Write a protein that binds this ligand. Structure first.
Ligand SMILES: [Cl-]
Ligand SMILES: [Cl-]
Ligand SMILES: [Cl-]
Ligand SMILES: [Cl-]
Ligand SMILES: [Cl-]
Ligand SMILES: [Cl-]
Ligand SMILES: [Mg+2]
Ligand SMILES: [Mg+2]
Ligand SMILES: [Mg+2]
Lengths: 336, 336, 336
């Protein structure tokens, strides 16, 4: 163990993959490399470390989703605490497995640096999300180098949920956040220009309104939105009123840039692991789907896991939950 | 030990306390919530970890001080190395004990993030004081959330002693330091507006002169001063000359803002643990007391401990030292 | 093990040294304190931790170099990973040994904080070089205090090789880098004004061109250059064309400031540990020596070690390599 003999890193072997189209940004759409408009449709699964701990990190999970749930995309929420606990080298080795599985099934990955808080002050909602600017840069530097020229890995979601929690974490400042995303994007593009960065707004990735006046000044990006049921709070709960509020905060973005709702979903207020902002009577499902389909918005439901809520499944035999059965039918129909 | 099951933090239970007035800032004074002018008068004790290590962290210490030494305030100098060694969760559990003890005795706490150095460059006088901007923010975020609405915890002293040690630690810059304090204050006020932040100047919390032109731009704060005997160095040592020098550097602040001299004290030049700037023949005692009483300045003597110098006590039976006997009489008389 | 009893640091004992001239900057030259023009001529050796691990950290190494290789200078490349692995206290104790050895032999040390990457974003070429702004400041704070007034330690080389690796590590920005060096210099000069800071440019300490318009705004400094054989790439390889390219990027600096080429050297393209940018047929040796001698440039060859390449020696009996035999003759002749 001489530190001077520690190897320089290696890149994923693209020859190990079957042919797969690259996804790219064109105006306000994604397109495949055949030129056809593309929509990300799929789910989040849990952090790789959580799945490994219960022996659920396996190809059979991806096969279930691709073959039975109609997904074309899986979002991997890589939690900083798990990145550190497994260690970068081991974690990347498991992401490699996901790449191979996904490629074999013809589906795509969104790699999400899964933190919640305010990166400019390095203050977070919970220790599982704890990180630094330095560690965040390093994650993207390592990821972009390793998966250079890998079509399967389509989207780099830079920071899951920006929030200052009522300014208890710092003073939210769009200019500062914009500049930091631009810095990350520049590192990424210096290493791989074929990948799609995904940028989020404040109020837990809900409010993209700042981009009306001050969008990120880089091409080829998309914007994230997390339009959970309780984020908009109209006094009268109907399509028209939710649509208008969604329009104002995030939906407008889809007129100019591609948008991925990288989290959405619900559970009954008296259901399993129910909490604000995910409580709903179920009318939200058809509403958000109708709204997204109208605008051509892409999405990954939270979450295809039986422990973390709101769940899509009740157990590891994949018994569907209320929202699981709903979205499964939606995705299957969209696939046709 | 699954990291996703680590609990979110809880707040101190205010129902566990007896009725106690809140202290607040009004102009250049502190007032209690009955509207009466209030003066912090008390002592520092040692870091909680030091006391626990010798089994001296107990209610009987607070009882000695309240009943026999006339104090209405105790300053807790929380050293970053001890915060890390005990760990936040355990350290906060011991601060809870202090809150309950102090509340029962009708006295107040000043919570002091006890570092010495230059936080903007993260360089310090000694490793026991080592911290980062990130860790400092986190400390105040955790403290402010936990003690929301707790009258007993009156003052949040953001950073004990700013100094660049002759610019060996960085280039002292008031604008940069001011901005950082303002950032901390904003985090604190976003979580609890009833607490009093206490801000310090350069030259080891001695020089408040920068606030003449550029005071912190936030309401409800106070300023710290550490007017140890050797900080002012008049050629002729008398009341008039020390008073003028104190006026110029820190005393003037009390005309506009409340001031707490959160450290002061002396030992004979040939006494126990004697060092610059605490050496004095004893004439300093009546002088600083006269000066503070004239201006209505609050204070906490350093230190009610038999090991750390200058001591107020010779042993844990509370045998008074020279300065201990002096200040004990002063505080007892002021209490009457 | 009470953290409050951890000692404050001590300074190297200058009384332990024999008389040795201080080296200082005067215009574009170094001069000794007798007023005579001085040129650093010597070698790098490996990191102290690497040498200790094979029992090669000993005075006999310095004696070999001074007595048999004509050196007046040794550059110590202190790798951050090794600084952390040995720990500051132990590492400084070994640097003390080097100081005593070097002083006894009448030779000088360049202390090099041996990182490769972009310090403003804290991203690096390899983990052995990993550091932070905080740790880098702390290193120089500790070094400058300890070796105050020690003539033997002549040059503080602040950061070995700045590079953004094609902007994959961050966006190279001269203004930001300049400001950071100025910050380090100010810390150093606040502690010891007799030492020479050595500042490097981008493209792995190759490109000093930014200083034409925006030199570091501090007196008494020198500039580093690492003119390895493949850094300049003329289509026709001859003296004239290399000289012009070297002139443009780094050589011009020697007209106004002292310059130390703190790394240079070569190995045959099919030789031991051959890599870009050190591959050459050997014509580089006479060329760079001629160029440096013309301009009065100082230098330390990389590297007097049998493992790290390009080597000056084949084994620890000091069998010379191709470049070793070449530079040994050059230095011996220059000494005469
Ligand atoms: Cl927010
Ligand atoms: Cl809730
Ligand atoms: Cl200062
Ligand atoms: Cl002293
Ligand atoms: Cl560069
Ligand atoms: Cl190569
Ligand atoms: Mg890709
Ligand atoms: Mg309070
Ligand atoms: Mg020196």
């Amino acid at each position: 163990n001489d530190w001077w003999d520690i190897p320089y890193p290696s890149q994923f072997d693209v020859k190990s993959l079957k042919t797969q189209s690259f996804i790219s940004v064109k105006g306000n759409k994604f397109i495949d490399d055949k030129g056809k408009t593309f929509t990300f449709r799929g789910v989040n699964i849990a952090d790789t470390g959580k799945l490994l701990s219960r022996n659920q990190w396996q190809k059979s999970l991806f096969e279930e989703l691709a073959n039975n749930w109609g997904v074309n995309t899986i979002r991997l929420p890589i939690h900083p605490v798990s990145w550190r606990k497994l260690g970068p080298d081991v974690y990347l080795g498991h992401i490699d497995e996901a790449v191979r599985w996904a490629n074999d099934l013809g589906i795509y990955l969104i790699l999400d640096w899964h933190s919640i808080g305010y990166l400019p002050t390095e203050q977070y909602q919970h220790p599982m999300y704890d990180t630094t600017i330095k560690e965040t840069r390093d994650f993207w530097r390592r990821i972009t180098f390793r998966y250079q020229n890998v079509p399967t890995v389509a989207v780099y979601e830079l920071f899951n949920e920006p929030t200052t929690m009522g300014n208890t974490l710092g003073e939210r400042n769009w200019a500062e956040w914009k500049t930091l995303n631009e810095s990350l994007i520049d590192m990424i593009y210096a290493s791989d220009k074929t990948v799609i960065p995904l940028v989020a707004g404040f109020n837990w990735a809900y409010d993209l309104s700042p981009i009306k006046k001050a969008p990120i000044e880089r091409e080829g990006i998309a914007y994230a939105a997390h339009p959970y049921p309780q984020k908009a709070k109209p006094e009268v709960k109907n399509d028209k009123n939710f649509f208008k509020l969604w329009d104002e905060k995030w939906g407008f973005a889809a007129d100019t840039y591609p948008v991925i709702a990288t989290e959405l979903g619900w559970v009954q207020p008296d259901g399993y692991g129910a909490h604000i902002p995910v409580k709903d009577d179920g009318s939200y499902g058809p509403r958000i789907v109708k709204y997204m389909q109208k605008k051509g918005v892409s999405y990954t439901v939270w979450v295809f896991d039986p422990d973390w809520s709101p769940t899509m499944i009740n157990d590891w035999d994949f018994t569907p939950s209320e929202q699981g059965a709903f979205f499964k039918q939606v995705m299957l129909e969209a696939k046709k």
